[PDB]
Design a protein around this ligand. Structure first.
Ligand SMILES: Nc1nc2c(ncn2[C@@H]2O[C@H](COP(=O)(O)OP(=O)(O)O)[C@@H](OP(=O)(O)O)[C@H]2O)c(=O)[nH]1
Lengths: 162, 357
């Protein structure tokens, strides 16, 4: 299953990728470039692409985009200053025709921080309630502790069962 | 600053700086500058990273890609200015650049390196940049090359739709301010990557990874950390009871000494072309001591003991070396490693006692 993991820098994407992969054998040095790992969950294998290529290199990824089945959008729930920018980046992605059928999992990350906005608050800030023809789920997480990650994967595996 | 040519303590301090860098690059650099091992200019630090062995190339990339630190940005610019990109095609230039640093990981890190690289390539090749309706086309193409390298060579992609020379060409349509980059240029770039992968030069950690894969049991708890260097390999015979005798070749262990750890293994296959290790136990060096012993049964004996505060003295393991020479060699290396580990922890407790203020 092809998964694209996006969100602003410092949201926790790379932390999530390695936390998720941690349980599977790393016998070799990963190839030069961005992060990509295959994660097996409830007998379903997900190839997760951890991306962030500005907007200058945004036209690329479009090759993959056609075959992307799921999107993981990671948000730093403590970063109020950049929440609108996160919304913009999400909506810019969702506008792509190539992703019209992709399912959306939102990780409202950094819930361990005392001033973190709740999943309900993030839902409002990202305008998720306005989306119609889309399968979406928001999951409160703390990537450092692993809390909420497998609950997110439960929803995503159920959406994609291939 | 050092003693007779090169001093045990100064060499230990230099190695401590490198150990600190490989854990935290900003902290390692500061330490080296303060201890007069590196001059304070961005050019000096750039040279140091480029030349001086013992630095993790992933960590060199982590430091150089820092985008927020003004010092790091200047270090990167000096680093890139030392490179000769004139008359090279983009892939050839990138091969050269990516050999000195590991251009892998976080998108923002990869972007910062690569943006610095692209600026330099364009300066060295102004006739190429004129062909383009947009200068950012070199930056975009640099990432298309990086992305191709990942697509072709990452096993997580699998020959699903691993890019053909046609998929690579079409993916880049319209990149040059609405127009295309030359078909033949893209074909060339593609065929060059297909013929040879972008790899990064052999690191001090390359050797640790080589060892780690030969070990079969519990790999030995991911020993290939950036800071970890392999001091030496040595065969020694394990002595369960120094008070009782034993057969000569009995309990043949294979020791691997890393700057912070001692790994012990029984062998597995030996085979012909390659040897594989079993993994018996792992010993942290902190708080450990080494002592030589000779009795009626063991001539070149060694006893490793750990002295923890309160529970004081524990006999971890006992060994017999095949010759006095090997005993001396191993003991000297292990003793130096312990002292290196001692001052490292001595430092981080002091560094933390200052943080609390
Ligand atoms: N407290 C907390 N921190 C988190 C959590 N998830 C990620 N982080 C932090 O977020 C920072 C950047 O995250 P990362 O996974 O590198 O991100 P990316 O989206 O930039 O690829 C890191 O901070 P540093 O670089 O300062 O270590 C990491 O420790 C979380 O749930 N809680």
């Amino acid at each position: 299953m092809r998964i694209l993991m996006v969100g602003l820098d410092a949201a926790g994407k790379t932390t999530i990728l390695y936390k998720l992969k941690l349980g599977e054998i790393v016998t070799t040095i990963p190839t030069i470039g961005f992060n990509v790992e295959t994660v097996e969950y409830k007998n379903i294998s997900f190839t997760v692409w951890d991306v962030g290529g500005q907007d200058k290199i945004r036209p690329l990824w479009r090759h993959y985009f056609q075959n992307t089945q799921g999107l993981i959008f990671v948000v730093d729930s403590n970063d109020r200053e950049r929440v609108n920018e996160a919304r913009e980046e999400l909506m810019r992605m969702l506008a792509e025709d190539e992703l019209r059928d992709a399912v959306l999992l939102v990780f409202a990350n950094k819930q361990d921080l005392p001033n973190a906005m709740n999943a309900a608050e993030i839902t409002d800030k990202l305008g998720l309630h306005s989306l119609r023809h889309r399968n979406w789920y928001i999951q409160a997480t703390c990537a450092t502790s692993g809390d909420g990650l497998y609950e997110g994967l439960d929803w995503l595996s159920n959406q994609l069962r291939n | 600053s050092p003693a007779f040519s090169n001093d045990v303590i100064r060499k230990r301090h230099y190695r401590i700086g490198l150990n600190l860098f490989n854990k935290k690059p900003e902290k390692g650099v500061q330490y080296l500058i303060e201890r007069g091992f590196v001059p304070d200019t961005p050019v000096g630090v750039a040279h140091f990273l480029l030349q001086r062995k013992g630095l993790s190339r992933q960590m060199i990339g982590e430091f150089l890609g820092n985008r927020q630190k003004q010092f790091n940005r200047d270090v990167l610019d000096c680093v890139v200015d030392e490179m000769d990109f004139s008359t090279m095609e983009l892939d050839e230039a990138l091969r050269k650049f990516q050999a000195h640093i590991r251009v892998q990981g976080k998108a923002q890190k990869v972007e910062r390196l690569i943006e610095a690289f692209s600026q330099r390539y364009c300066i060295c090749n102004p006739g190429v940049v004129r062909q383009f309706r947009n200068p950012d086309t070199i930056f975009i193409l640099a990432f298309a090359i990086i992305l191709l390298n990942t697509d072709m060579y990452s096993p997580n992609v699998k020959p699903e739709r691993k890019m053909k020379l046609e998929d690579f060409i079409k993916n880049l349509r319209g990149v040059d301010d609405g127009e295309d980059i030359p078909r033949e240029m893209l074909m060339g770039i593609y065929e060059r990557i297909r013929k040879r992968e972008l790899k990064t030069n052999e690191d001090h950690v390359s050797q640790v990874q080589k060892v780690e894969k030969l070990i079969v049991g519990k790999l030995g708890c991911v020993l290939s950390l950036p800071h970890r260097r392999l001091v030496c390999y040595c065969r020694l015979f394990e002595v369960p009871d120094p008070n009782k005798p034993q057969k000569l070749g009995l309990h043949q262990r294979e020791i691997f000494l890393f700057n912070d750890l001692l790994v012990v293994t029984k062998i597995f296959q030996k085979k012909k072309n390659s040897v594989t290790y079993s993994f018996r136990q792992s010993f942290s060096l902190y708080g450990m001591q080494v002592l030589l012993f000779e009795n009626q049964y063991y001539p070149n004996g060694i006893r490793l003991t750990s002295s923890v505060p309160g529970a004081d003295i524990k006999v971890l393991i006992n060994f017999n070396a095949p010759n006095p020479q090997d005993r001396k060699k191993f003991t000297d290396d292990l003793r130096e490693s312990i002292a290196e580990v001692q001052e490292m922890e001595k430092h981080r407790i002091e560094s933390e006692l200052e943080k609390q203020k």
